[PDB]
Design a protein around this ligand. Structure first.
Ligand code: HEM
Ligand SMILES: O=C([C@@H](c1ccc(Cl)cc1)c1cccnc1)N1CCN(c2ccc(C(F)(F)F)cc2)CC1
Length: 449
């Protein structure tokens, strides 16, 4: 407009749109976009301009520019004490970038050969421990939460580390470290100034020492040559920066935390929703097609099995992520002016792009609330559940590898029944959204012949 996108009327100032938003971000966001008559628009939040990019045709405008034009650092300040100053965003873009590459090289399909069997074993344990009986009632959001942390550690943690730490203890440190997070923290740069840092630094420093000790070990076993291991930790130790330096224990600790928090809720939600959708009677044909896919697999899967021969199960997981994205907003700080469609975005704005809003556009996704694994985006790029462009998730392959394997293992040895009429409602209260906890009670039936 030789100017900014349309602005949205504030009835009660100094809050902005903070209240109807928190209740239902989706109901709210859709209202504006229609009423504004524009898929792109600014909202006020605490006197802070927030322009949401909600016309799928424009995602490229959001995801393509460099960090110097659209900076992620600022919206993500709420992460530094969980990762450490100078790690991830706190770290400067050259080194932040460097760091992500390290982690990236650890999560590549190269290192995934032992992963598919490692996952099968660790899921199969859990089932025998908690799904003991012929029939029972468990909470799926909680059981997934535990299977996810279990198999990931089984994958990315070395035997020595997993001995002197277990999944459950580490998960309890994830909860301890994270819970300092309030969603509405990222929208007042004074609130960086805790009744919770002083449990966060304790859980980190407990962890960072433990890892330090673990490193003492491996070195005084290197000349000994007892074993060969290349886990995420060991991978990061061998890490060398461009300028020949290496990661301090603190950076390394944070990166392992960052990797682990990163995947923790997102994929456990993802696994849950998928399970929820599939177990529903409205969705049997899909479960049926799911079975004609996992039916002539042997009880022990290889990397080939999940990767190249489960294409339909991939669709289910993506549709779950499409329908109910776990990260609703992705955000940047508009350091410089960027043109969006027929608008401009002024230096100083907060530009956001919402997987939640986007996945709901009717052109791109007809019946957006209908779960359809065979659906395909009808605008190209509509789906941004793993983000896009410069910042596409690096955990995508891994997340899918887990979830596909889990569904397959778990639907091979069980049936399921939702103790409800309708699939859970998304709970929009957490910074990472999943299905409502208290609705996820489900009843398993151990398959037999
Ligand atoms: C289904 C599970 C997951 C979902 C839905 C998901 C979603 C996303 C999204 C939306 C972004 C982009 C955020 C942005 O644009 O600012 C992203 C980036 C990322 N995710 Fe994930 N993620 C998942 C799993 C994981 C896992 C398992 C890891 C680690 C192994 C991980 C680590 C990352 C990293 C490092 C980025 C990089 C963003 C950047 O370049 O700064 N995620 N993910
Ligand atoms: O921690 C992450 C990333 C992530 C970035 C870097 C690294 Cl090294 C690891 C993880 C993330 C979290 C979960 C899955 N994938 C990436 N966040 C945390 C901040 N995020 C976020 C989520 C929601 C909101 C809010 F409140 F506006 F809706 C604002 C920010 C989404 C991205």
């Amino acid at each position: 407009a030789k100017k900014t996108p349309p602005v949205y009327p504030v009835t009660v100032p100094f809050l902005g749109h903070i209240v109807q938003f928190g209740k239902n971000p989706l109901e709210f966001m859709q209202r504006c976009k229609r009423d504004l008559k524009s898929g792109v628009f600014t909202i006020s939040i605490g006197g802070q301009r927030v322009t949401i990019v909600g016309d799928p045709h424009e995602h490229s405008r959001f995801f393509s520019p460099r960090n110097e034009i659209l900076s992620p650092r600022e919206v993500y300040t709420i992460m530094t004490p969980v990762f450490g100053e100078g790690v991830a965003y706190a770290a400067p873009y050259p080194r932040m970038r460097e760091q992500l590459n390290f982690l990236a090289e650890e999560l590549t399909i190269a290192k995934f050969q032992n992963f598919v069997p490692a996952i099968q074993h660790e899921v199969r344990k859990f089932m025998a421990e908690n799904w003991k009986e012929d029939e029972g009632v468990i909470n799926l959001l909680e059981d997934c939460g535990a299977m996810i942390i279990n198999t990931a550690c089984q994958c990315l943690f070395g035997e020595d580390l997993r001995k002197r730490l277990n999944a459950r203890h580490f998960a309890q440190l994830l909860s301890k470290m994270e819970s300092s997070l309030i969603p509405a923290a990222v929208f007042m740069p004074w609130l960086l100034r805790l009744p919770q840092s002083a449990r966060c630094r304790e859980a980190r420093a407990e962890l960072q020492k433990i890892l330090g000790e673990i490193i003492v070990a491996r070195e005084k076993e290197e000349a000994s040559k007892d074993n060969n291991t290349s886990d995420l930790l060991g991978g990061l130790l061998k890490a060398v920066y461009r300028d020949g330096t290496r990661m301090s224990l603190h950076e390394v600790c944070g990166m392992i935390v960052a990797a682990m928090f990163a995947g923790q809720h997102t994929s456990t939600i993802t696994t849950s929703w998928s399970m929820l959708h599939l177990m529903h009677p409205k969705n049997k044909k899909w479960l049926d097609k799911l079975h004609k896919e996992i039916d002539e697999f042997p009880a022990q899967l290889n990397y080939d099995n999940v990767m190249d021969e489960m294409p339909f199960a991939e669709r289910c997981v993506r549709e779950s992520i499409r329908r109910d994205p776990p990260l609703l907003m992705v955000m940047r700080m508009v350091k410089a002016e960027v043109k969006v469609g027929s608008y401009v975005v002024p230096k100083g704005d907060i530009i956001a792009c919402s997987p939640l809003l986007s996945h709901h556009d009717e052109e791109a996704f007809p019946n957006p609330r209908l779960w359809d694994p065979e659906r395909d985006e009808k605008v190209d790029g509509a789906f941004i559940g793993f983000g896009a462009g410069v910042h596409k998730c690096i955990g995508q392959k891994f997340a899918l590898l887990q979830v596909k394997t889990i569904l397959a293992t778990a639907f091979r040895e069980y049936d399921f029944q939702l103790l409800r009429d309708e699939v859970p409602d998304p709970d929009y209260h957490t910074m990472v959204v999943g299905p409502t906890l208290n609705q996820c009670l489900v009843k398993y039936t151990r398959k037999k012949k």
